[model samples]
Target: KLPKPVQDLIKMIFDVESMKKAMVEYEIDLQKMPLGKLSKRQIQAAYSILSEVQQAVSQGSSDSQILDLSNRFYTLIPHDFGMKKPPLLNNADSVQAKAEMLDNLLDIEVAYSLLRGGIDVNYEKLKTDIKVVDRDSEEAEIIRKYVKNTHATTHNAYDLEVIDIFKIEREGECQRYKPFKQLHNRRLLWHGSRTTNFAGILSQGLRIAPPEAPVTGYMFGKGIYFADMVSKSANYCHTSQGDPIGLILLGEVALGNMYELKHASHISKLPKGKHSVKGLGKTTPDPSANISLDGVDVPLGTGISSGVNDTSLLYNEYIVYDIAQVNLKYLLKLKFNFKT
Candidate 1:
């Protein structure tokens, strides 16, 4: 079983078609209804309605009443008529350990599915260990059929979606705004005193100047240290306030000849030097380029650069002595595993 976050990462990679479908549908919806900006009051009201609707849903008796209320709440968004819908949830969104999460879900399904089998395979054992005090109802039978069908359905190693990644992206990108604003304001407005000895307020008005925006962000970080290794990949690299969505390598197909196997395993679960991690690691030339917000290229600074990664897809050619050093517990991890 694959670890969860990575599993979610794989789901994203694997569900390219589903995501594309969603995006295309969203584009159509955008063209038809468009994304309407809610006024502050309307936004607040929407949230207020969400709370009220949730509370109202709890008051509903019976499954039909609950289902009706749920439907109403979903349709409550006024702007989109049928415009926006929520994304599907998956296990990758779970907070459990990456490996255990994958295993547990399959575990849950297998157990439930077996329990729901028409004739219990272990009826003899269960007869003594388990007891049925009440007969099954329609709802119970329906639930049993659902479990059976769900378990019978085949799923890839990467089945769950990781909504947490959206959260992770939000968290990482949140810091990006401050850096952008710092570059935006650049220089503070200068205040000057009016000298009025006898000239009656000489130079009364302060000289107005264009905003002197400072170049910050990756460029600022680049200015600190940059290097020019033989540019490994042809893909051009640029430094700026860029999209925080850094590296995206999800489920990739692997080929095996005399050199490697052709299995299509995810890059996340491969053991170091044991099972090849697919689509995770790539070497690239470390090139540095600088530019002002005004679109002018700046002079090259000290030629040294560093490649930082948030995953163990691969390793620096010589940055660390040992592979274990990459995921050392001393670094920014609370609860994690290097299980291959």
Candidate 2:
């Protein structure tokens, strides 16, 4: 029997109603672009428009140009600004937010598609596969320490409290990951996303952007992104003070032959023989402090200067284009303690 917190978390993540409500909160026009109607082609078209808008904003284009691009974007995505002037996607933050919205929308589409089969079937699949890690267990202890030790002091504002940990077994995921299991430099890393995306994430495993989508917002282009620092990935949860609880994934990433980069690259393809891209940050976990968990390295090292000068990023990011290189390991439930 699952604990009350575990049950609650599952319900919250899997609730399709809340997912639709989240879209409403984003001002998405439900009547025009309903959940089932969200298509990759349409989302790709929206992304294309956003890319143009971003270019226009960054180049200090004229208001008319910005307005044209913004209108194109809104038309494609169908936002409900409600009798008010639709805000121009003229700033980096607003443009990025919309791009992220597109990202979440894709996952929501995935969730809705999975549920189209049968909601009861999917819920049973989720419930049967998720096993609660005992709070006193050694595995739980390792995860707790990893969270505590790897919390970034530089970029973090709130303290994180580990609430629960659930070990998951996605049916057939192990067989899918077997081919890449022998790759070198395998590390247990963190991957976080919004609660609204969890249903899709759990059912389908981590995925990359489709070929139809534009590669504008991804710093490393289309791939599954992971982070060594706990806080770095936690930021992706998009949790608020009112909704302080968030879920994070610990995945075993086969980072074989990392093609290290210091700046953003819209890399459609990796260099020959490279397996993954590592965005070198100014600060990273000390390699000497890495620990092993069942033959996988856990980079729970304390923050240290990476000695990588002239890098655009403040923290490290790992991107693997091939989704099979990642094996979902653990799901951690965290409570973000916001200070006044």
Candidate 3:
């Protein structure tokens, strides 16, 4: 005679799917099933066999192996799921290991797939543990709506949506600007005398400038340093008091990859073989043309370029952007898995 626990298992497997007695809720019902007759070791071996069967179906196992493992799997439990052959012995596993294997498989199938009446697998619930998302700002709302609208709707299920929009190309290039007043006005309106002087009266009369231009945005400490052509002509003076000034307009120039000599003639002579380090030679160029924002390219005044004798040992460049107000968002994707 089988052990009392084994008898109870034998009764449940046959009893529930057999419909001998009305099926109790199989999920909870199966969990309550006694496993005193089984050993965890056998349960693990059976679990391994199930994994093999699953892997075989997915990868490179022969049909024979699938047939064999698949059959071996059912031998542990009476679940045909629509397979053939009643068990050779209903309570066949006298060995504690194989007996417990049946118990382990029962636990997984019950929690994951075996609902009250039938096998209704919740693939989403089975796979997803938890997920978090942040859409705190109006820009985020615009981005989400823009992206979602561009893709086919998934009934608002957050399905088939991509995330982490990255760097975009510049909409414009860099240059300079010159006002119209500088173009026409010459050095004639110079006024150093007070209002009592006739020259001062003439200077004030020539002042017809402009009006309120509707401006946007506040930019303090938000602009990039630019180099512009102020040529030698604007400040050229023919005489001392008769110094003349002219207009040369230049826009905000963003210095990109500018080389500045931090140290020059840094040549140091050391004993032979001790100074053999290659950095002693002209320093290696940056491995890649571009670097991440936080890489060696940043933290201004760090050692970059290298050489001795009027050569630059460090270089820095001002980073400028055309659009200063753009915002960025980050998104994450997650996946979860559990035994089923």
Candidate 4:
């Protein structure tokens, strides 16, 4: 849902679709002119109005209460296209300071949570478990301490309360729905700030496919992740970085029909024979209607893998996208045509 001010403005200024188009077109237009325009003026008014009074909205206010407070702020005057809004005092609705502090504490807690309550897992576990050899080992003792105190405190970040999931509502279906169909709602948190021990993600990426495709999935939201592109000096070293840094989903997503390559190829040089591969493009389609996603199915032929996912390899001179489409009618097929 939009902030009430933006909602009201949309109704008062232009229709919903029109405003969205204006926002997009004006956003581009602003870059060319890079200056004041009616489009810029309208968006500023909506944002300024929302920020000025958003705090005054108590946590318990109803629709009537919100309507009551709309008039408290003075009209937003758009000066230079790049003009600023003067600061306001009485930050009644802001919990950000406390939230930040709480987040820091959470980092420490999760750091401990991942390895604290468990024994330090190493290849020596078999020897250690079988033999009571660490009579006075400090490392063993420390691990034991965390293991014993597994119960977390009230402000722990790992708890479900700190995380959230985007609710999927489809039109008239939403009105009768109770936010969810079942009693349980669970989610995970990705902490980009790695000041503590446990801030890391093991894997992350985009997987878009339609129902008819071999696979299907959903995306609740989307956000950016900052990654460190470290180039190592040594030839003999691990190339893959920790996958902890992942995208954050902030809102609704449109689940379009998509496909991916079933496999990715990392060949260092062109092969003598004809073959298809993956990992050739940064991305193909999202808003671009002219192109739909699929495996590399060109003159050489379609790739063995779905064309949706990325194929990665460290080698530079590899010929990746070269494959021929298969003729299912000409191929052999032994069905689950039951052994019977």
Per-candidate clashes come to 13, 0, 7, 24
Better by lDDT, candidate 4 or 3: 3
C-alpha displacement of 120 in model 4, angstroms? 4.7
Best by lDDT: 2
By TM-score, rank the candidates, best first.
2, 3, 4, 1
160-254 in candidate 4: lDDT tens per residue?
11111111122233222233222121111111222121121111111111111111011111111111011100111111132111112111111
**Can you rank all candidates by lDDT, best first?**
2, 3, 4, 1
lDDT per prediction? 0.22, 0.82, 0.25, 0.23
Q: Highest TM-score, which number?
A: 2
Off by over 4 Å in 3: 1-47, 54-66, 75-140, 153-340
List where candidate 2 sits over 4 angstroms from the true fold.
Answer: 1-5, 30-77, 88-96, 113-120, 125-128
RMSD for all candidates, in order, please.
29.8, 3.2, 34.3, 25.3
**For model 1, what is the alpha-carbon lDDT of residue 305?**
24
For residue 107, give model 2's deviation from the true position in Å.
1.9
TM-scores, all models, native as reference? 0.18, 0.85, 0.19, 0.18
Question: Please, what are the lDDT tens digits per residue for candidate 2 over residues 73-133?
Answer: 7666787888998777777678877777877987787667666655345667553377789
